[PDB]
Amino acid sequence: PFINRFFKYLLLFLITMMILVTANNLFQLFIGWEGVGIMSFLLIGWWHGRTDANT
Amino acid sequence: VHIEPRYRQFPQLTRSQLIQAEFFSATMWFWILWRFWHDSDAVLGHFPYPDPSQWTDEELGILPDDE
Amino acid sequence: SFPKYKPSRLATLPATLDPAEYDISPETRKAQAERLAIRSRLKREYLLQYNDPNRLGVIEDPALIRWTYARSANIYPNFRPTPKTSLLGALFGIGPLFFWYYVFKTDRDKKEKLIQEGKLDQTFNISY
Amino acid sequence: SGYTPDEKLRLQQLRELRRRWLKDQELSPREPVLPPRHSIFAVTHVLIPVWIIHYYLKYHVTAKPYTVVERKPRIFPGDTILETGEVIPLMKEFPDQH
Amino acid sequence: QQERDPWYDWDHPDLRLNWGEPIHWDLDMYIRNRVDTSPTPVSWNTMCKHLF
Amino acid sequence: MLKIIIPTTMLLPMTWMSKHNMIWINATVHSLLISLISLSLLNQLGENSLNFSLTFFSDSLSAPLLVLTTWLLPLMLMASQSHLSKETTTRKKLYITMLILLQLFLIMTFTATELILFYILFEATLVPTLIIITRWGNQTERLNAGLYFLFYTLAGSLPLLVALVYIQNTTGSLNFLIIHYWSHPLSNSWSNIFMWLACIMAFMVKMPLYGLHLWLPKAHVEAPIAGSMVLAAVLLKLGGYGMMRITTILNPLTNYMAYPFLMLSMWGMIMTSSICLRQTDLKSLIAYSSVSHMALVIVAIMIQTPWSFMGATALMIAHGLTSSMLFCLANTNYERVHSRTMILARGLQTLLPLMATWWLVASLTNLALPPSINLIGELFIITASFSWSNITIILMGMNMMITALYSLYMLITTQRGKYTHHINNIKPSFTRENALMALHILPLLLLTLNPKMILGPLY
Amino acid sequence: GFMLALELNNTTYYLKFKYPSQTYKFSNMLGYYPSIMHRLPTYHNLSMSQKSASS
Amino acid sequence: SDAPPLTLEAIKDRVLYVLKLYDKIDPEKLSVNSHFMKDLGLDSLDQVEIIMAMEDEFGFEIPDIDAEKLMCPQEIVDYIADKKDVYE
Amino acid sequence: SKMELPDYKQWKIEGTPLETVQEKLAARGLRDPWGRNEAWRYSGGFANNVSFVGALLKGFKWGFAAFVVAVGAEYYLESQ
Amino acid sequence: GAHLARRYLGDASKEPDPLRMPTFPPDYGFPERKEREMVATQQEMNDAQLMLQQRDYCAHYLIQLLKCKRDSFPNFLACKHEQHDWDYCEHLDYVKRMKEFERERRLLQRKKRREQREAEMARG
Amino acid sequence: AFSAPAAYLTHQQKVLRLYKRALRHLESWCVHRDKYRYFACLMRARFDEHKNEKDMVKATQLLRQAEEEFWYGQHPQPYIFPESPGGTSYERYECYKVPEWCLDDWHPSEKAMYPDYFAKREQWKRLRRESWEREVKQLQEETPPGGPRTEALPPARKEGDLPPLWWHIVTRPRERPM
Amino acid sequence: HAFFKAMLFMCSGSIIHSLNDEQDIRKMGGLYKAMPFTTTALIIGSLALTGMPYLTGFYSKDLIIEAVNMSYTNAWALLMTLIATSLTAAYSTRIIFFAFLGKPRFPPLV
Ligand SMILES: CCCCCCCCCCCCCCCCCC(=O)OC[C@H](COP(=O)([O-])OCC(O)COP(=O)([O-])OC[C@@H](COC(=O)CCCCCCCCCCCCCCCCC)OC(=O)CCCCCCCCCCCCCCCCC)OC(=O)CCCCCCCCCCCCCCCCC
Ligand SMILES: CCCCCCCCCCCCCCCCC[C@@H](O)O[C@H](CO[C@H](O)CCCCCCCCCCCCCCC)COP(=O)(O)OCC[N+](C)(C)C
Ligand SMILES: CCCCCCCC/C=C/CCCCCCCC(=O)OC[C@H](COP(=O)(O)OCCN)OC(=O)CCCCCCC/C=C/CCCCCCCC
Ligand SMILES: CCCCCCCCCCCC(=O)SCCNC(=O)CCNC(=O)[C@H](O)C(C)(C)COP(=O)(O)O
């Protein structure tokens, strides 16, 4: 039912990864680093009612 | 494309999927064979490996155990 | 016959491997019946309010209130200064402070002593 | 073994009520009563952003020194420079180990 | 809470608790999103020995 | 700067002369207007401060604090009007009057030119906060909290007063400009050591320092929502501002008197981050978060470097906004379920999705997600500490981990999982609450866009 | 590797059943790394954070 | 799309089908109301095997406490209907 | 849609490894009363399957023929 | 590999050390040795910007290969002869390195054996 | 999940559960179907070998030994059905389950759509409201003075009664709600 | 590796979605003929992963192995790299054998 959110989530991860890959300074690379980390946290726990996904 | 369940029988297969699968397997094998024919050196090596035991002392310039 | 499994604190003993369950007595059965009766009474009390059409809000759980109060506000009144309590408190509240103080004081003294001698390689060290 | 008659009767009644409720969950035909060009994608999603970015780089980013730095092109023997017209000499008469 | 029976109709299915029963002092440590003490096929201090 | 002071003293009779059903609207509108007027103070110079008159001056460190205070008053007004509906008109006017007086006291406190006037206003801020906590709090603990709030402060601040007057008997003046221009080194004697302690301990208690922090969880849990907002957002920053001002006359003694305070700050940062992992109260988690962040600010102020000062200012502003937002988020659930237990209401994302988004953003900002000003302040302080000693990165690193854990823990405990079956009084979120969270969060990212406005005078 | 894996998988067709060795247990349970490092450090950290830091 | 909307008639057909492939039960003697214990002369282990065959047929596990009580194919069909929210 | 199950009397364990299993169980005096239930996995179109080496060489014939034709053409294309 | 087993199990005294090598003068056994020459000047190699590790004695073939690759861009299968030449020059370099290793091993073993024989003769 | 548990498990129940677990883990070990059938028949023979032991002490001793053997020889990674408590889809759809009382808080504009559904909801609510008191009175009469001793609930007995405590069981969200 | 790893995961997902969200290989039977295109894709991906000559994974993994062979490096690391590159083919064989060969083991409702 929330496929639009899923596609949006996929696109945000891609944007953060481009930020990571194209970075020229350490601060921007850190921005991309933490962005993909947070997007991974959000996408791993896609089914937030399931305990194992949150774990 | 509508395919119904079968219940303990082989699933219904459309010709397109078998055609695609066979074509892609055949093209993979063709590419492998063609590249092996035209780029064999990348698998068997290009230049011979020399044996250091067959090198004379004249070119290696080691004194004959006197000086 | 087969290798034995020994339980630990973080890997407990299975219910089917517990010797105390294979040697049962009628008093054990009575205890189990009493436990089931207590649980059934609590379940019925909960379900009466759970299914009530006119109930609007949160059903108060005395167990949760007791747990939170025990974890928060009941600790100091039940505290006594004992050799164990005093020793654990002094250790865990003083030892880390002095340990880190010694570490940082030694590190900074070494750094300053190197600085005075003029050998620290502070080139391009503009920002501090 | 098996159910008891009270248990069987309760399961039967609960099953009947549950099936009734599930049936009621169905939708009548009118339930959603709602109250009261080809290649435009390549224009509004590719052409406009590239126009804006070209403007911003050409006239604003380039306006300040050392904002767009490119590594120098590689120079090989036998090349001619575009600006000065200078030609690069050849490479020291190869031993030609044919 | 992982060791508790998953096929029982708990009042709180996620926490595997029932209304009114006593709560463990360290429940938030054992919420099954956290430290698990369930039995393992290979005993402790044998997995420790192999890993070390 | 009487153009900001006088409109608040005009808010006083305007509230006391308004109609019974227009107090909230008038107060909110005019407090927003006063905040907009105060926004002009951000135009700061690069060499000196804005010396308005013999009694008031504005620096690049105090101007963001004034702006934050003036921005926080309307938020407190919006958060208070929900639980104050049944109160009588006179008591509502008295509550608004207490908030107005607190704002006026803070406004004069952050801009006083002399140390004695600053002390007088910094101590006058106690009375409205104590009255609010002890009168409009919910449970019986509030009274005790009030006592813990009061004496903990005074026992640290009364000696400072003596020190202050003693300084005026020696240097002849307490004006900050004369004090800065006529500074002299402090010798190595027991008298100078005790003068250092008298000048420092008051602000150390106000932060609070670890071991002197026992009043904070009580005061921040037992106080009403506006009380909690004003205690976490601005009142904790008085200690940091005062320490920054007063450390100009304490050199070079600080070079070795900062050791025990630094060790306490770092180890207590770790300890409070660890405490946050096992908390059954949702408000206490935010309170101990505040303690950890203020410990970071204490370390930054103690090591005395331009980078540490910049990071301290940024972290002060960011933490004020973040903790106020988190307190409001907790208060919404408390108003829905009338209980502060964290594991009581679970799976709230299914029932309140936009509130789940607000919770997610607040928690992400709490754990210092780049490029938020939270991370800017934390990273500047971390780099300054690494320059101070390479080993610090261990302890800070531990904190940088633990923080994130408990942050997400809070989120996953409240928003994820399955809803509690027996809780059926969870109504859809009002527009007032959504507007409150939006007005908390949007300035954070806006300041992220322009981070030089909150980096202090050392920028 | 192809040949050895194919032989070991073809072995599974035989009508023989044997209890697994300790090498199979080590490989199947990921060297017991999740079983030890996700139970000992977490338990000690949470216990110390409640018993000592808080109480 | 996904699986078709399992109906009561299909569930009964599959239950009877799997039962009629068991060697210890006569196909003709079996009815939808046949009892496994009394009518059929099977023991408890045979019931356990039939329950596991049902689980393998329908791809989900029946808890033991619910599994022991099932004694006739009608009970199995009803249990699978309730677990899967089949009303038609 | 509207599909009915096939008859249950066509599933037989004759000519399948299930027959071998029943034979070994017979020598021990035991029996397997569930073989017809698993007979469907061997009866129909799932009767035979390729080997691993056969799976790896799925489309080797067409690919080899195309390669041979291409080599023959290339050998007779350099003659220009 | 066998040289590894020879050094790590047999006599390491007569085995060459890759880190400390050569231990003999370059003109020790040879009467005259020709100084190894270079075909690419430092300036050309700088303008080409090869790499700091590609600037070996076979840089000229790499430079020509890169020039052809740039010239023949759309046809990425036309740069075969010069790639072969660069590969051949690298192979010759490796063969020379193998010859140096063999020279060092033979010199070390011969010198040590000759010194042992001289000591034995002087001890008789 | 649906049936009320008892105070304890009988020996026959323990043996049956051991049989089921052993068969499942043996199937996990024996991947192929014919091999599983062969060793399942062997395991059934092993189980019914001691079926006729009259000494309960020796029966419990055999059960103990069989449990120990099973624990030693269990599969470290057994097969779990996807929606079983250990499966890969155990609590997958719990996030899509919304309680029915939420519909009580819908805006009138939202309720303007689906009129017939909310009419039926009103009928169900009225039924619950009328039946509550009769369910309460039935529960009191049936229960023993010393409180209930089991989690079982009585069914309806009178003319138009309903089984007590039925609302939250009947109006479950769904197994696949969204 | 991006290419064939992503395509292998898509092939696994196709199998999982086909058999009612089932991920265990013990219950996936003869899919060589039931899923011809999936079988072809997974066979090609496993061959590329195992460094089959002149495919995608050959041009990187083969060079990596030859580069670690001719380097002044740790001997234990070299041995572990070789054992790992054998185990790669091992687990690819496991996947193919259990998922695509043999007789069906999935539930009968096809
Ligand atoms: C020619 C020149 C090159 C020379 C190279 C070497 C020359 C020899 C060539 C071949 C040598 C190996 C031949 C095959 C290997 C054996 C495979 C096997 O599975 O055997 C079955 C057997 C277990 O089978 P099972 O449990 O009955 O099967 C259960 C069912 O089948 C369950 O069924 P399932 O469906 O689950 O499937 C089970 C699965 C897997 O079943 C398993 O779980 C068993 C795992 C065995 C695979 C391990 C092989 C790699 C070894 C790496 C170890 C690194 C060091 C670890 C350090 C530990 C420190 C404690 O089977 C497979 O999928 C295939 C397995 C591997 C086949 C592919 C082998 C290729 C790699 C190995 C050969 C390398 C060739 C190229 C290398 C060239 C380099 C120059 O394995 C063993 O018992 C021996 C394993 C060796 C372990 C060595 C560690 C030492 C143990 C004692 C330590 C004593 C401590 C003393 C005190 C110390 C105090 C601190
Ligand atoms: C819960 C947390 C509460 C907050 C804690 C606040 C921290 C306040 C601690 C004060 C920091 C240091 C105080 C004095 C500075 C040096 C301390 C001493 O250890 O240094 C030596 C001092 O030597 C000995 O320590 C003599 C002092 C002994 C008497 C002090 C009492 C110490 C016992 C601990 C009591 C705990 C105090 C806090 C009570 C709550 C240096 O020797 P010396 O060079 O000669 O003195 C330097 C001064 N000169 C130059 C003028 C001569
Ligand atoms: C640098 C300073 C810090 C370094 C780290 C030291 C150890 C940190 C310990 C953290 C304690 C945190 C306690 C609370 C955490 C939240 C609770 C929690 O995570 O639950 C455990 C949760 C559940 O376990 P599952 O296996 O997923 O079970 C699910 C199926 N039932 O799993 C976990 O997250 C456990 C994670 C703890 C890992 C700690 C051990 C890691 C040690 C790494 C050290 C090695 C360094 C590597 C060096 C590389 C070379 C340069
Ligand atoms: C794969 C690795 C795991 C395999 C290991 C496990 C192997 C264990 C094998 C040995 C187990 C036994 O024999 S244990 C044998 C226990 N002996 C008895 O129980 C005797 C008394 N009889 C009864 O209790 C009932 O008749 C009853 C038998 C329950 C029938 O029940 P029903 O007729 O009313 O259905």
Tab-separated table of N, CA, C and O in Angstrom, chain F residues 122 152-160 163 193-212 215 239 243 246 250 257 260-261 264 298 302:
chain	number	residue	atom	x	y	z
F	122	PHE	N	20.043	37.489	36.769
F	122	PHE	CA	20.262	36.051	36.707
F	122	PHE	C	19.697	35.336	37.923
F	122	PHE	O	19.318	34.166	37.822
F	152	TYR	N	19.917	24.457	45.300
F	152	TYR	CA	21.045	24.052	44.470
F	152	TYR	C	21.642	25.248	43.750
F	152	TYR	O	22.867	25.382	43.662
F	153	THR	N	20.791	26.137	43.239
F	153	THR	CA	21.293	27.348	42.608
F	153	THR	C	21.948	28.264	43.632
F	153	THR	O	23.110	28.660	43.474
F	154	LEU	N	21.236	28.565	44.718
F	154	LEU	CA	21.673	29.631	45.614
F	154	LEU	C	22.959	29.259	46.335
F	154	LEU	O	23.864	30.090	46.471
F	155	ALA	N	23.076	28.006	46.770
F	155	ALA	CA	24.295	27.560	47.427
F	155	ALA	C	25.514	27.713	46.533
F	155	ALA	O	26.639	27.752	47.042
F	156	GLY	N	25.322	27.787	45.218
F	156	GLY	CA	26.437	28.005	44.325
F	156	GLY	C	26.598	29.457	43.936
F	156	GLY	O	27.690	29.886	43.559
F	157	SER	N	25.519	30.233	44.046
F	157	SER	CA	25.537	31.585	43.503
F	157	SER	C	25.806	32.641	44.565
F	157	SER	O	26.311	33.719	44.239
F	158	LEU	N	25.462	32.369	45.819
F	158	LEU	CA	25.697	33.325	46.894
F	158	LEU	C	27.183	33.631	47.084
F	158	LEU	O	27.536	34.806	47.235
F	159	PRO	N	28.083	32.637	47.104
F	159	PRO	CA	29.514	32.979	47.164
F	159	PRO	C	29.977	33.844	46.008
F	159	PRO	O	30.765	34.775	46.223
F	160	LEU	N	29.482	33.585	44.795
F	160	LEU	CA	29.863	34.398	43.645
F	160	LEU	C	29.633	35.875	43.924
F	160	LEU	O	30.520	36.705	43.683
F	163	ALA	N	32.413	37.262	45.887
F	163	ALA	CA	33.539	37.434	44.981
F	163	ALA	C	33.358	38.682	44.139
F	163	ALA	O	34.257	39.530	44.072
F	193	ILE	N	42.854	30.738	44.205
F	193	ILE	CA	42.165	29.480	43.933
F	193	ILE	C	40.720	29.546	44.411
F	193	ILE	O	39.789	29.150	43.695
F	194	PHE	N	40.502	30.065	45.620
F	194	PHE	CA	39.138	30.135	46.126
F	194	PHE	C	38.324	31.207	45.417
F	194	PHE	O	37.109	31.054	45.267
F	195	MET	N	38.962	32.285	44.956
F	195	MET	CA	38.243	33.246	44.124
F	195	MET	C	37.812	32.613	42.804
F	195	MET	O	36.696	32.849	42.327
F	196	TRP	N	38.686	31.800	42.206
F	196	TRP	CA	38.329	31.061	40.999
F	196	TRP	C	37.125	30.164	41.250
F	196	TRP	O	36.170	30.143	40.462
F	197	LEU	N	37.155	29.415	42.353
F	197	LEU	CA	36.045	28.519	42.664
F	197	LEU	C	34.752	29.293	42.893
F	197	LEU	O	33.685	28.887	42.421
F	198	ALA	N	34.828	30.414	43.615
F	198	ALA	CA	33.640	31.219	43.868
F	198	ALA	C	33.063	31.776	42.575
F	198	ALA	O	31.841	31.868	42.421
F	199	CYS	N	33.926	32.168	41.638
F	199	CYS	CA	33.453	32.699	40.367
F	199	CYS	C	32.924	31.624	39.426
F	199	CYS	O	32.109	31.938	38.553
F	200	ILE	N	33.359	30.375	39.576
F	200	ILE	CA	33.018	29.334	38.619
F	200	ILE	C	31.853	28.451	39.072
F	200	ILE	O	31.046	28.036	38.229
F	201	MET	N	31.721	28.173	40.375
F	201	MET	CA	30.803	27.130	40.831
F	201	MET	C	29.342	27.457	40.543
F	201	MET	O	28.543	26.540	40.323
F	202	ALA	N	28.966	28.736	40.548
F	202	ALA	CA	27.578	29.096	40.269
F	202	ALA	C	27.173	28.660	38.869
F	202	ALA	O	26.167	27.961	38.677
F	203	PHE	N	27.968	29.049	37.874
F	203	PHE	CA	27.687	28.654	36.505
F	203	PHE	C	27.861	27.156	36.312
F	203	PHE	O	27.153	26.558	35.498
F	204	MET	N	28.779	26.527	37.053
F	204	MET	CA	28.905	25.073	36.970
F	204	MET	C	27.618	24.389	37.408
F	204	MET	O	27.162	23.431	36.775
F	205	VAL	N	27.016	24.869	38.498
F	205	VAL	CA	25.742	24.326	38.948
F	205	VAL	C	24.632	24.600	37.945
F	205	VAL	O	23.773	23.740	37.728
F	206	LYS	N	24.630	25.772	37.309
F	206	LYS	CA	23.527	26.100	36.411
F	206	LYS	C	23.529	25.297	35.111
F	206	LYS	O	22.500	25.268	34.429
F	207	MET	N	24.644	24.654	34.744
F	207	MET	CA	24.728	24.008	33.433
F	207	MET	C	23.771	22.834	33.259
F	207	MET	O	23.009	22.826	32.278
F	208	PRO	N	23.751	21.811	34.137
F	208	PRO	CA	24.547	21.559	35.340
F	208	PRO	C	25.753	20.658	35.100
F	208	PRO	O	25.800	19.886	34.149
F	209	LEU	N	26.752	20.750	35.970
F	209	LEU	CA	27.881	19.837	35.933
F	209	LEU	C	27.479	18.483	36.510
F	209	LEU	O	26.592	18.386	37.359
F	210	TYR	N	28.132	17.426	36.031
F	210	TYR	CA	27.850	16.090	36.539
F	210	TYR	C	28.221	15.996	38.012
F	210	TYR	O	29.298	16.433	38.426
F	211	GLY	N	27.327	15.414	38.805
F	211	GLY	CA	27.437	15.408	40.242
F	211	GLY	C	26.727	16.561	40.916
F	211	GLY	O	26.367	16.452	42.092
F	212	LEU	N	26.508	17.655	40.190
F	212	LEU	CA	25.712	18.779	40.661
F	212	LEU	C	24.398	18.882	39.901
F	212	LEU	O	23.750	19.933	39.936
F	215	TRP	N	19.236	18.193	40.602
F	215	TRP	CA	18.024	19.002	40.583
F	215	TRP	C	17.337	18.966	39.224
F	215	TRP	O	16.120	19.177	39.143
F	239	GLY	N	24.231	29.551	32.473
F	239	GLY	CA	25.507	29.131	33.027
F	239	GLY	C	26.631	29.200	32.013
F	239	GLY	O	27.730	29.664	32.318
F	243	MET	N	29.798	31.693	32.292
F	243	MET	CA	31.150	31.153	32.344
F	243	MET	C	32.016	31.739	31.239
F	243	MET	O	33.180	32.090	31.474
F	246	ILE	N	32.919	35.243	32.365
F	246	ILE	CA	33.747	35.386	33.556
F	246	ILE	C	35.134	34.785	33.383
F	246	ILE	O	36.051	35.149	34.127
F	250	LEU	N	40.129	34.910	34.856
F	250	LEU	CA	40.578	33.756	35.620
F	250	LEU	C	41.848	33.118	35.073
F	250	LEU	O	42.302	32.114	35.631
F	257	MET	N	43.151	24.587	36.796
F	257	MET	CA	41.959	24.374	37.608
F	257	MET	C	40.835	23.732	36.817
F	257	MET	O	39.810	23.373	37.404
F	260	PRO	N	39.742	18.804	37.207
F	260	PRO	CA	38.651	17.995	37.775
F	260	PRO	C	37.318	18.228	37.094
F	260	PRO	O	36.545	17.283	36.907
F	261	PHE	N	37.039	19.470	36.700
F	261	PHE	CA	35.800	19.763	35.993
F	261	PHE	C	35.767	19.099	34.624
F	261	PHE	O	34.720	18.593	34.212
F	264	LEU	N	35.177	15.307	35.281
F	264	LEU	CA	33.779	15.127	35.645
F	264	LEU	C	32.883	15.265	34.428
F	264	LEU	O	31.978	14.454	34.227
F	298	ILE	N	30.379	22.265	28.626
F	298	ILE	CA	31.304	22.567	29.718
F	298	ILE	C	32.733	22.248	29.308
F	298	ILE	O	33.657	23.027	29.561
F	302	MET	N	35.743	24.971	29.025
F	302	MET	CA	36.903	24.810	29.891
F	302	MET	C	38.208	24.775	29.108
F	302	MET	O	39.206	25.343	29.563
